[PDB]
């Protein structure tokens, strides 16, 4: 019992009900069902159409624009459980735009284990409020029942018993409500709770062999709680042995089935590799393994995106074809996609592949099976691969080539030495015959410098590096065409000049060491530099020449450049944040930034100008100086400064302090501190001296410490009776009159307040000073 019929897969029956007849003997949809877009079906097609054998669907159901279909009580009256093993956007049921569908009628619907219900645009669909989905769903929150006939209230949803509501599906079928102790296991007709591994209904209560469906798992006519060994948890509803999973794996020799976690799984979970004997997903030995079975056992690699598909491949059941001819991030994206590969069943093709130089970025690629052979029974191909200088570091990369030979043709920068290395390492050495490998088109323009050039003396200046090195001579030294020094900049060690031959002429002790000075160089900069010989290809066994080693010479921690952007902000009357950048040529580990500053005094002509004159347009602004070696800091606030005084500042940078300071050239900047407030406010008393002729002489102590200097003085005199009249006191007027001097004015009491005016601004009025000259009548 539990399942008398067959087990049928997931199906999508489309546009006609002829394919629905394939659900004849089906009791489990091992999958989902989707009957959709049947514009041509009519209710006559659904009167003689039923499949009550179906008990369980594992994934879901979908209905969409099936015309003629009016109720599901005929097609599947005995469907009970959708497992929700796969969901359709968290729906185990989507009923959408079902024209003619008037009711669901699924009175045997008891429990949805996983998912929700989407019911939308089903213009005739009634009995939607009569269904208790909370009996059916453990979570009815994500349901979508809208836009139906049930919403705009016209549904005569009459249950057979003609807010708390009675429950049905049709006019003739209620919703079977089991007791609460019949939790999801359901009940039989008298209401006795089923077996605890039943789910929703049972032919006989409390019997796992007389369940209608299983709560969790099924094995051999019986709802099991788990799949006991040797049975594997098969598709999360049943229990199958090894041989079932095994033989379906062999039929897919499709999801070739494997085994992990007591489950016949299609594919191994994370970090796991199948064990081909027993399908066991064993942990790999980091990255995860990836066998890339190719389309037609071959794939052309011509671009980075052609490698992005093969990103992560490890073993290739097929061959590869390579004609990448240029682009950005070559050999690096190509390693990141493709160094990961280790094994190739088929051959390897490289034709016309232009801009690359080596294959070392195939880091793990240690097997060519050659199972697919290139024609001529080659497991390897190389044609027109122009800039290729290298197969691999054959001291590092070891490589197996099982079958096939080596096609080496028209690849003019790969030397034969790499080839014989590949012969030895590949194990293919005695395979290759005549014209498998071209001798005269390959590495013939690489010159294969079997020797080294050696440097005999190196002098560096800061921008200039004298190299001396050994003069190479070929045995026929006519052929020495030149010497070919190569260089570039390299702050890492992750890695052109032609020089003529020197004068042969002799060798008792001849410095015919050709020497070389470089010139324009950024000082303190590491330079990957190497020489090559320039000679002639011989008409005979060619003298291969030498090339010097890539030497990494740094230019000299020399005088560095101007330390950039000296920004001098006088954030106080004694504080100035001088900030700056390093020099553009820092030219060494800059030990300190050599800050010099100097106070600039006020201008001399300002002391001797009459600022009482209109035209008083005033700007409102060895020897050792106070200095600072700003070690490892590119800012400096300077303290101990006068208020309101322009300063001159010199900046240098030193990358050298203790032996004979090699410092930068000067960076000048100039700034004035803020004023003080009460520097300009007048100190000392306001003294009046009134003569007999009432030539009144005024006296006052000056603002002794001003904001820089004092340009003029202002006095306010007004009678009780008069208004403020005016008269100015300049620097020399104050210095000569020792204050001020008024001559002969009006009776009635005056009062005097006195302001200082400075370069910074005004120093506040003095206190009102009270005095009276002789009235001579009263």
């Amino acid at each position: 019992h539990l399942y008398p019929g067959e087990v049928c897969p997931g199906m999508d029956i489309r546009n006609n009900l002829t394919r629905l007849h394939e659900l004849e003997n089906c009791s489990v949809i091992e999958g989902h069902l989707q009957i959709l877009l049947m514009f041509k079906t009519r209710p006559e097609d659904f009167r003689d159409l039923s499949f009550p054998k179906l008990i369980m669907i594992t994934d879901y159901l979908l209905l969409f624009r099936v015309y003629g279909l009016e109720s599901l009580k005929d097609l599947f009256p005995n469907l009970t459980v959708i497992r929700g093993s796969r969901l359709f956007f968290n729906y185990a049921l989507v009923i959408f735009e079902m024209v003619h569908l008037k009711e669901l009628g699924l009175y045997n619907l008891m429990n949805i284990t996983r998912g929700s219900v989407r019911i939308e645009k089903n213009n005739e669909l009634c009995y939607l409020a009569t269904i208790d989905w909370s009996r059916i769903l453990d979570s009815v929150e994500d349901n979508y029942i809208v836009l139906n006939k049930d919403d705009n209230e016209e549904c005569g949803d009459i249950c057979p018993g003609t807010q708390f509501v009675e429950r049905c599906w049709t006019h003739s079928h209620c919703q079977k409500v089991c007791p609460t102790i019949c939790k999801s296991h359901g009940c039989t007709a008298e209401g006795l709770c089923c077996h605890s591994e039943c789910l929703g209904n049972c032919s006989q209560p409390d019997d796992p062999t007389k369940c209608v469906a299983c709560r969790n798992f099924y094995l051999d006519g019986r709802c099991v709680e788990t799949c006991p060994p040797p049975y594997y948890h098969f598709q999360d509803w049943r229990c199958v042995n090894f041989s079932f999973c095994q033989d379906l794996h062999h039929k897919c020799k499709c999801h070739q089935y494997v085994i992990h976690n007591n489950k016949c799984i299609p594919e191994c979970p994370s970090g796991y590799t199948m064990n081909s004997s027993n399908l066991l997903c064993t942990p790999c030995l980091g990255p995860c393994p990836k066998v890339c079975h190719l389309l037609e056992g071959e794939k052309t690699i011509d671009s980075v995106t052609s490698a992005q598909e093969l990103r992560g491949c490890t073993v290739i059941n097929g061959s590869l074809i390579i004609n990448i001819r240029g682009g950005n991030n070559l050999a690096a994206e190509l390693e990141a996609n493709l160094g990961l590969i280790e094994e190739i069943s088929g051959y390897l093709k490289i034709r016309r592949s232009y801009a690359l130089v080596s294959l070392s970025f195939f880091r793990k690629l240690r097997l060519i099976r050659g199972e697919t052979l290139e024609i001529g029974n080659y497991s390897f191909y190389a044609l027109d691969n122009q800039n290729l200088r290298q197969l691999w570091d054959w001291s590092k990369h070891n490589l197996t080539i099982t079958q096939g030979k080596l096609f080496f043709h028209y690849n003019p920068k790969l030397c034969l030495s790499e080839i014989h290395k590949m012969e030895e390492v590949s194990g293919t050495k005695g395979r290759q015959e005549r014209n498998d490998i071209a001798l005269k088109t390959n590495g013939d323009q690489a010159s294969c410098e079997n020797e080294l050039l050696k440097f005999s003396y190196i002098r560096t200046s800061f921008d200039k590096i004298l190299l001396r090195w050994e003069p190479y001579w070929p045995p026929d030294f006519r052929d020495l065409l030149g010497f070919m020094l190569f260089y570039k900049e390299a702050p890492y060690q992750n890695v052109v000049v032609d020089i003529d031959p020197p004068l042969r002429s002799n060798d008792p002790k001849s410095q015919n060491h050709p020497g070389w000075l470089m010139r324009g160089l950024k000082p303190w900069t590491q330079y990957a530099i190497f020489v090559k010989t320039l000679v002639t290809f011989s008409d005979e066994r060619r003298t291969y020449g030498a090339k010097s080693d890539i030497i990494y010479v740094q230019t000299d921690a020399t005088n560095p450049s101007v330390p950039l952007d000296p920004i001098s902000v006088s954030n106080s009357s004694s504080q100035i944040i001088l900030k700056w950048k390093p020099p553009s040529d820092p030219n060494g580990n800059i030990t300190h930034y050599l800050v010099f500053w100097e106070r600039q005094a006020e201008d001399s002509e300002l002391f001797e100008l009459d600022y009482c004159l209109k035209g008083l347009k005033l700007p409102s602004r060895e020897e050792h100086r106070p200095f600072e070696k700003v070690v490892n800091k590119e800012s400096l606030v300077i303290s101990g400064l006068r208020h309101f005084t322009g300063y001159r500042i010199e900046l240098q940078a030193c990358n050298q302090d203790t032996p004979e300071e090699r410092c930068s050239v000067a960076a000048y900047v100039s700034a004035r501190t803020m004023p003080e407030a009460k520097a300009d406010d007048i100190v000392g008393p306001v003294t009046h001296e009134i003569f007999e002729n009432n030539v009144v002489h005024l006296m006052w102590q000056e603002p002794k410490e001003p904001n820089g200097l004092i340009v003029l003085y202002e006095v306010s005199y007004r009678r009780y009776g008069d208004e403020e009249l005016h008269l100015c006191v300049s620097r020399k007027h104050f210095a000569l009159e020792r204050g001020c001097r008024l001559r002969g004015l009006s009776p009635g009491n005056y009062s005097v307040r006195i302001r200082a005016t400075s370069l910074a601004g005004n120093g506040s009025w003095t206190e009102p000073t009270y005095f009276y000259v002789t009235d001579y009548l009263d």
């Binding site: 969409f64 956007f89 959408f96 939308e120």
Partner: peptide, 11 residues
């Protein structure tokens, strides 16, 4: 939803 409706149906 109805974005995802027809993307899965029509081949």
């Amino acid at each position: 939803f109805e974005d995802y409706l027809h993307n899965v149906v029509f081949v």
